[PDB]
Amino acid sequence: STGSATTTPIDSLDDAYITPVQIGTPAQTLNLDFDTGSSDLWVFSSETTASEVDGQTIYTPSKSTTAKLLSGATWSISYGDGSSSSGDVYTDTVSVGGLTVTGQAVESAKKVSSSFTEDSTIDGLLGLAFSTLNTVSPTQQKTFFDNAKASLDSPVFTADLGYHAPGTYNFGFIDTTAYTGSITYTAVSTKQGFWEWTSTGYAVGSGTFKSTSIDGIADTGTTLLYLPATVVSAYWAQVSGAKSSSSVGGYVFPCSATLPSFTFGVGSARIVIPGDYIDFGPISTGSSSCFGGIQSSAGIGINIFGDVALKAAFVVFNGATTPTLGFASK
Numbered sequence: 001s002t003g004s005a006t007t008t009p010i011d012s013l014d015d016a017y018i019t020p021v022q023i024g025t026p027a028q029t030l031n032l033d034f035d036t037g038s039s040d041l042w043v044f045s046s047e048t049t050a051s052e053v054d055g056q057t058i059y060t061p062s063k064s065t066t067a068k069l070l071s072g073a074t075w076s077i078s079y080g081d082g083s084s085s086s087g088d089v090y091t092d093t094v095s096v097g098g099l100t101v102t103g104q105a106v107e108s109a110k111k112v113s114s115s116f117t118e119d120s121t122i123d124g125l126l127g128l129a130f131s132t133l134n135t136v137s138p139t140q141q142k143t144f145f146d147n148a149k150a151s152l153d154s155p156v157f158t159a160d161l162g163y164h165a166p167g168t169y170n171f172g173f174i175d176t177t178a179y180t181g182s183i184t185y186t187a188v189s190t191k192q193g194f195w196e197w198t199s200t201g202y203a204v205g206s207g208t209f210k211s212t213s214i215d216g217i218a219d220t221g222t223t224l225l226y227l228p229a230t231v232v233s234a235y236w237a238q239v240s241g242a243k244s245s246s247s248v249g250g251y252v253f254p255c256s257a258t259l260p261s262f263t264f265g266v267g268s269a270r271i272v273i274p275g276d277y278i279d280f281g282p283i284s285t286g287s288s289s290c291f292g293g294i295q296s297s298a299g300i301g302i303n304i305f306g307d308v309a310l311k312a313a314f315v316v317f318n319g320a321t322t323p324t325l326g327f328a329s330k
Helices: 144-151 229-236
Strands: 003-009 017-023 028-035 041-043 068-078 084-096 099-112 124-127 156-160 167-171 184-187 196-204 210-218 225-227 243-245 250-254 262-266 269-273 279-282 289-292 294-296 303-305 314-318 324-328
Touching (some): 196 229
Parallel strands (some): 225 294
Antiparallel strands (some): 068 084, 156 167, 196 210
């Protein structure tokens, strides 16, 4: 089997991407944030504290003839930005772009933090990291991909995120028309539950490539590119007037600037992030200070190849017995 679904930016800055997902019988379609940096499929629901729902579409398990309470199971998750959610668990039928999993754990939110409430466009998350990170207790649950894998034509999914435009998540096949040149594969460590890999270095603009190992995670659920302070400083030093602002919480730059590209290595291959991908616009409405899309990972404890990096590539998440990651230009 295979599946294919379009993923769409939630706003003009590509702050996140949403993908429609069918849950239950009859189908209830919710727009979920596909997140290769976590492993829970959770949704706003009829159980979510009413004051914490503001415009989201909810899953109502009592209206699904295939929903079953997973007795005794609860979940609770916190993300890298300090947001969180928790609740109980149902199993139900879940379909993505024509690919159907029966008995998928659908984690129903009883509580969500303010960042989720305030984002009317995201109805929940669909985790695509390794199932070892799933938070359901006392019986850990499998991700949608893990459940689908054995049925797929090939045990893979691909992320093809657009810059200020829709893109695609495919399950079970590699669309050879969706990228240019060849796909370069690179080793993955699953030890921390992430799609963790080692980039071979970087360049800033038309500058020379610096060969240096950068361990990090491929994380579609993180907006920006978080890299070591040395790398980030080298980037922003090429932008007149750019500075790190403690009050704003990262590097900012004059909105009048033309940003240089940023290249990262995948083995001997190179992915080029155009400068415009690194512009996240005014820090506040009407400001001439703009927020940078490349930020320091210092104090995160891990480097993160988030959407800024991933959207410059066609990315293969290969879930074979020994997982790997593939990157192609597009």
